Amino acid sequence: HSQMAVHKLAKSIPLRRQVTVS
Amino acid sequence: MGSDTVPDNHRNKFKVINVDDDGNELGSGIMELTDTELILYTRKRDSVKWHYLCLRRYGYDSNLFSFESGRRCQTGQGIFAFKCARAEELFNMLQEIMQNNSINVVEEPVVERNNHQTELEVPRTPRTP
Numbered sequence: 001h002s003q004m005a006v007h008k009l010a011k012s013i014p015l016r017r018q019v020t021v022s
Numbered sequence: 023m024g025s026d027t028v029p030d031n032h033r034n035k036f037k038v039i040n041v042d043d044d045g046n047e048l049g050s051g052i053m054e055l056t057d058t059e060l061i062l063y064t065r066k067r068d069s070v071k072w073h074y075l076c077l078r079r080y081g082y083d084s085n086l087f088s089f090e091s092g093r094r095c096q097t098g099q100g101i102f103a104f105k106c107a108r109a110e111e112l113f114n115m116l117q118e119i120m121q122n123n124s125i126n127v128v129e130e131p132v133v134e135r136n137n138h139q140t141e142l143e144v145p146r147t148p149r150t151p
Contacts, residue, residue, distance in 0.1 A: 001097060001098065002068065002095075002096060002097070003064075003065060003067075003068045004040075004062075004064060004068045004070040004096050004097040005040035005048070005049060005050075005051035005062055005063075005064030005065065005068060005070055005097075006040055006051070006062055006064075006070045006096070006097050006102045006104070007040050007041055007042040007043070007048055007097070007102065007103065008042075008043070008097060008098060008100040008101070008102070009042075009043055009090075009100055009101035009102060009103050010043065010100045010101060011043065011101060012101065013045075013081075013083065013086070013088055013101070013103060014083060015081035015082060015083045015086075015088055016081075016082065016083045016084060017081050017082060017083075017113075017129075017131060018081060018129065018130035018131045019079075019080060019081060019117065019127045019128070019129040019130070020078070020079030020080070020127070020128045020129075020130065021075060021077045021078070021079060021080045021116070021120060021125065021126055021127040021128070022075070022077070022078060022079075022126035022127075022128065
């Protein structure tokens, strides 16, 4: 984990857009 | 600093909140989109910085920064949720930062009409009831 900030979701969210940047 | 005619006016970050699965906010970090890095400042010590396009699929909802990067390091593998007001800036910017390096940003929603793709069905045939 190394602390960091950006937590983990492991699940999509109700987004308004959909740009999947590889 | 460096003595070679180098300006400083080149900082574009976004105070994004590091949220968990549920989304009840954890702390708060500064998302940075340098010329070649997504340095996500946090705890004034930990820097969750990716290689920009090292992600996998990035999105956003009004004022929510969503970005997912494949297995690498920092925090781990999975989707990331962030809460900010400059969500537009970050996104919009990124979208531009990608066109500069021909980065991949496979966009799905692009307002279609009728139907572009075709599915297996035709030609049809009469059943004769």
